[PDB]
Design an enzyme around this catalytic site. Sequence first.
Site, PDB file in Angstrom:
ATOM      1  N   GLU A  21      -9.843   5.642   6.836  1.00 51.08           N
ATOM      2  CA  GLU A  21      -8.422   5.946   6.745  1.00 51.08           C
ATOM      3  C   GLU A  21      -7.978   7.192   5.965  1.00 51.08           C
ATOM      4  OE1 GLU A  21      -8.007   1.791   5.394  1.00 51.08           O
ATOM      5  OE2 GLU A  21      -6.347   1.618   6.831  1.00 51.08           O
ATOM      6  N   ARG A  77       0.857  -1.175   0.000  1.00 50.59           N
ATOM      7  CA  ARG A  77       0.000   0.000   0.000  1.00 50.59           C
ATOM      8  C   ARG A  77       0.901   1.236   0.000  1.00 50.59           C
ATOM      9  NH1 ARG A  77      -4.779   1.470   0.224  1.00 50.59           N
ATOM     10  NH2 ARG A  77      -5.632  -0.635   0.508  1.00 50.59           N
TER      11      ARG A  77
END
Lengths: 49, 99, 1307, 49
Positions: C1236, C855
């Site tokens: 997030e 990520r």
Amino acid sequence: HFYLETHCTIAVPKGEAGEMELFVSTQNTMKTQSFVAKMLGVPANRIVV
Amino acid sequence: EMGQGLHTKMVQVASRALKIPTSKIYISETSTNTVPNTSPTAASVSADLNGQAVYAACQTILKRLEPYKKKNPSGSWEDWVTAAYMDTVSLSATGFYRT
Amino acid sequence: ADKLVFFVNGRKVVEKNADPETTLLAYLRRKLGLSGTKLGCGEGGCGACTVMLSKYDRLQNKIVHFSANACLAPICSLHHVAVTTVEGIGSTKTRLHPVQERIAKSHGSQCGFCTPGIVMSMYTLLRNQPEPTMEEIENAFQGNLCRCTGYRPILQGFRTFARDGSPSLFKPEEFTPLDPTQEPIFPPELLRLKDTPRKQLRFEGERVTWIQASTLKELLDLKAQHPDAKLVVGNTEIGIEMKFKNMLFPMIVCPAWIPELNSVEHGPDGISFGAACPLSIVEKTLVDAVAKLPAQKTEVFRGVLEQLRWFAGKQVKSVASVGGNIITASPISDLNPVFMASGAKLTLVSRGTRRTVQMDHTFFPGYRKTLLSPEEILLSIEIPYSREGEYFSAFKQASRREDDIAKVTSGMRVLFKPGTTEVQELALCYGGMANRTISALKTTQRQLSKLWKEELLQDVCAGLAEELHLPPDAPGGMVDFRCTLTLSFFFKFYLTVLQKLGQENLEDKCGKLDPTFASATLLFQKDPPADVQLFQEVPKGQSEEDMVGRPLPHLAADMQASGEAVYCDDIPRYENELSLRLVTSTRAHAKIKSIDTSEAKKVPGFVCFISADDVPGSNITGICNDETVFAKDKVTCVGHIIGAVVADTPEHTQRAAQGVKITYEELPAIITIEDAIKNNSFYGPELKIEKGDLKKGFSEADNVVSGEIYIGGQEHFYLETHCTIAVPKGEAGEMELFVSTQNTMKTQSFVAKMLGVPANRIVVRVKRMGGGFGGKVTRSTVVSTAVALAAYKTGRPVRCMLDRDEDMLITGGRHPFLARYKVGFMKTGTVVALEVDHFSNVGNTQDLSQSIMERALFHMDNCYKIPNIRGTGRLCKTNLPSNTAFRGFGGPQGMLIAECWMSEVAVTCGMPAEEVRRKNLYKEGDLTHFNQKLEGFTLPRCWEECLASSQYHARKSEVDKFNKENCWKKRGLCIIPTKFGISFTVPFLNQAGALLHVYTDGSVLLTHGGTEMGQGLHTKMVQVASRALKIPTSKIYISETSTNTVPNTSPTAASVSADLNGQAVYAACQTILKRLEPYKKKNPSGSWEDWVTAAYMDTVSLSATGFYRTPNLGYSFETNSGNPFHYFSYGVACSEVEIDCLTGDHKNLRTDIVMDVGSSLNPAIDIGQVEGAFVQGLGLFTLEELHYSPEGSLHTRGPSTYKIPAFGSIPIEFRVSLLRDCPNKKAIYASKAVGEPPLFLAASIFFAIKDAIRAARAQHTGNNVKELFRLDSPATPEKIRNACVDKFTTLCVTGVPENCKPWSVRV
Amino acid sequence: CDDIPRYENELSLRLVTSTRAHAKIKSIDTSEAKKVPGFVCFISADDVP
Ligand SMILES: Cc1cc2nc3c(=O)[nH]c(=O)nc-3n(C[C@H](O)[C@H](O)[C@H](O)COP(=O)(O)OP(=O)(O)OC[C@H]3O[C@@H](n4cnc5c(N)ncnc54)[C@H](O)[C@@H]3O)c2cc1C
Ligand SMILES: Nc1nc2c(c(=O)[nH]1)N[C@H]1C(S)=C(S)[C@@H](COP(=O)(O)O)O[C@H]1N2
Ligand SMILES: O=C(O)c1ccccc1O
Ligand code: MOM
Ligand code: MOM
Ligand code: FES
Ligand code: FES
Ligand SMILES: [Ca+2]
Ligand SMILES: [Ca+2]
């Protein structure tokens, strides 16, 4: 009937939204749920048997 | 369960429907929050009725596992199960039956 | 003596065998069954255990009310006191109290674990000050911490109590009015017991004897006969010693009742304070005195008040006595440096003896020692009035402004000869610069008779740097920063005195005061908050019963505020339940040579000690079959779980664990990312994404910049730590576990594998978590298996809730990152080539490391298109506790690195940063470096919308203007964009299930794989189900998440839980509707209940499962193709800061956020998510930091040393708005994930800070507008001060030999 | 059912039944029950919510 285990119920209040859990020696979980719900005045989704 | 061995029968029934050992199937308890609006366990028809609902639920599962069973016939039930999961396929199903 | 009697919520409590070691929090939760008061740290720094104490003051003849930490309050010190818990002021069972109602309806409660405490702090305030000012309201929460909300909603909601007085998130006009006469009565019984004279009491516990002295004679005769006897008043020091420093004072004596020790006298030389006087009283007395007396006679008083302003919080100040702070003699006492510099007069008494001494440097002989003899006790202290031509200042600097330990704390005093400016007396005393409170004697003595002018300033600084200099290996570290502060403090003192002399019209016989220097003397101050939230209204004709898009508050908010919401440990223990505590390694890496239980077996209530040999199944666990359930033959990190101890009480397990002796044989250990790189110690191969042609890219580039940066880790600090309750059923290995976890599926299978039983035997239940933030996605199984094994071993139910110190040590957190970059760009700002090598310290197991690094790599571009790019990453295998998932999952690290070199590209092109960023932005339809297409690219709107909202350009002038007018304070303005990919990098985790039942009474009971940890997921799911079914949300309930209702669920993470489950919930609703159709048709005018009844009686199944999986997901690093994400989140934030170039402190002035959450399912929840996420980002980049010793041992294990964002840490002006008209066809009801994405936007504060430091540097050191200095994360006050190089830091810079063993080393 | 462990705060209940086949309930006195050790309370129809 004389079932060796007589009638028994353990009612455990959860403190939230009238939620209550019941351990019951019964052959009719559904009517237990609704009869207890009608008596307490709470929706049936708050009572699990 | 009140001693009539209803669960044993259901585990047997389900074991035959999925074609997997009864050792792989477990029944823990009866609960209003897993199966709702159930009739009372009476009139001697609890195994007739439930055995049929357990059966149906099993058929739904077999149906979903089919694709993975064909891509690997020599494979085991565990192989097909994880292939199904790995391929985002629901491994939970309900079953209902009415006379 | 003997019987302990007090009250709890009006009810009388009679404890016949009170144990001196029993805390109130322990008595309330474990004896009275009041679970409302929570355990968050047992360290007094989180306020989650806050309660109100009421007592009849036999001195003032009144009923007093104040707050306190129940985790530090010994019940033995509560005789005849009335305790009020959250459950004592209201509840949904009766009526909620205004405090509870407002914080709930205002969206000031997410996970809710901190709510009771906040509520009790606000409630207590209102009890003493009925119409407080905003300042007073925020001040009451200094000792309170929230990790979810971001604080704003809490203050916004309570603003309604203050006398300081697009639709909205709530309606304040609807709050029920507060009638203070309806508060619970002070127990009439206690008022009648006030007439029975006080007599000494004796309590005897298992190991401690407590004596409650009623008179001074008793205290003196006792101390003269038992000099060891430990005095205890507030217990805020001794309580820490016993619990954390594992100390045991068999005999304690509490003198709090003795009137001589509580007296307050106003004499001719000052105001004396009884030694037991709580700091709240000293403060109260002094503030009234400063208002009544001449300013010239209160210089010292003002200094003490400035310190108490930053001394702990209300709870601690209400019980902590002034004498307690003195005697403790902590080197970092904030009061002793002040009492010493002003020479406070201390009256010491022993049986028969009595003396007085005015505190100086000799009063503190050595470490934690004082001049008192063993039989002596501190009776009282006199705080001096100020004399003509006498001035006093006080200072303190830590990591965070509120409730924190001082790095350097000081009290400075000076006496000028009458009518002149020549120094007659000078005293500079410090805390935190040595073994204890000291005085700069050598340096001050030399300034006597010297005029207060430039020459003295220069000589004093030079002298302080030499005389107070600290060795490179000094305990605590940060020597340079610390020394710099002692000089910097004096500079402020210096400047401040020039002003004060100017008041005397002596501003000619003293050094010149530069106008730009002025702001340096100002005491901290902040404007009133300006908070506004903007979001979209729902369609004009949307059904009033359709909540989707409406700001419906978190479903459990009321019960969370009333303390009724039940968390794991709140569940009642079974009459046969046991407590468990983990025994962990104290070596970073070594062989276990032996384990001795001898001492553990001697603790009362001890049941057993389990270890690897007790596992019936497999001892290999972890996501990568990387670790052991219990260490076998070896420990691979300080904290490695070796075994567990089982006993009857938490207190007993503590003692038992302490009794498990473990001897080791040490092995070489790899700690730092550099140790790994050097030993080629990694997990798997190098990860890499490459696109374009680097060689060609850097060759076409006008300029090429190389650099490095470090990003520190982070602890989740969920207010509720890890907890697992496992109840064995005794049949076929069945086991039921109640766990605070984001991953029921892995918990179930990890416990199954450990016990060696089929998964169908293990059921994992989760009602709610007091926070998760990723820290409970996998590490929670570590406590679960241990408790599981204990339950399996004992056949009895067992539970375990880690203490904050065990949790922080054992569970690990966000991955620390070290990156090296090389960016190639043109003189126009356009970046053409980019190389970035990432390195992450993962610890002793791989856990989620690989996925996190991917990520990170997926966001190494952020929002900028780079034609030629190469990014690589390495997972460093180290002997530290294993790190894991933390909100952002690698994204925040990768993106901060991108903004790092991007900030440099601009500086180097001499161009405005917003222009350089604006032009390197992706455009609709571009492919990322991993070749995905950016459709629905809303980032451009967010950017333009945010520039207008914050008036970026217009304020850019305001910033330059302030920096030109101020020399020792600078400001920075920065705007940052972000792009976050939504969906699990692991494709097959993008699936979800739901189970829906409709009962014959019409009510619906719904469940799905998602767990509630405060993000309002259940609230949203009910909302979705309501809309789909066309029935009121009031008819749908969601009780809990369970492995036996919805199997094979993905952890509640990656922000997709609302997308996935809302979809499965939706699918289940459709199944039900399709079955009800026949009956709806036959009776259109009928009601829902009618249809359900009809369907039921026509034997139609009223139960259905729902399933969903995101389609077409799957990336390949091999071919760099396929889509990793289903869609992206977009946002932009502009942030302005003001830093103190002299201390490293800073204010977050304003932050404007424009977030794209598509068509919000719930804008109240999403704005709270944006605010919460951003504030955690604020902590990741500026306040939170973890220190490890050279041998891999974590030093930071609690809120005292780990400073997360406090109420006052949020931006004064906080503006958040949800992007309008931007439906997301890719998710349930056009919404977008939001958990997030926002967190990284806090990076705008990070670069605004660097912008300011830029300003400071450019002035205090000639200049170099192209200069590219390094600033690592977090940008804490140490890093900010050291970065601000000036004539002060120049004198403060220690060498660091080869053989030097530093206190801590960077991981 | 009754083999299930009790929680630490779990209470026991016992029904109070009629000793007549058909009669009016003139009154109910709990003076003595209240004196029993561990007595929590007596509930009746007035208590159903
Ligand atoms: C969350 C938290 C935050 C804190 N923040 C700060 C801070 O910002 N600044 C700071 O300086 N401190 C701080 N402390 C330390 C502490 O609160 C102070 O030192 C406080 O005044 C201790 O007083 P007490 O009454 O609780 O002492 P106790 O713990 O009851 O006693 C401390 C010691 O003093 C002795 N003692 C007490 N009275 C006498 C007497 N009359 N004669 C002889 N000996 C005596 C005891 O025997 C013992 O050694 C903090 C503590 C906590 C838990
Ligand atoms: N109050 C609160 N908010 C929170 C959390 C939490 O534990 N408490 N976990 C965060 C993380 S790390 C994620 S991935 C999402 C998870 O929720 P969601 O998947 O349902 O969106 O919420 C975020 N917001
Ligand atoms: O991509 C994520 O955010 C993620 C989170 C938890 C576990 C596995 C994952 O891929
Ligand atoms: O009497 Mo049996 O049908 O329940
Ligand atoms: O994906 Mo959040 O669980 O850190
Ligand atoms: S638990 Fe008491 S302050 Fe945290
Ligand atoms: S809502 Fe405050 S810590 Fe969760
Ligand atoms: Ca777990
Ligand atoms: Ca953690």
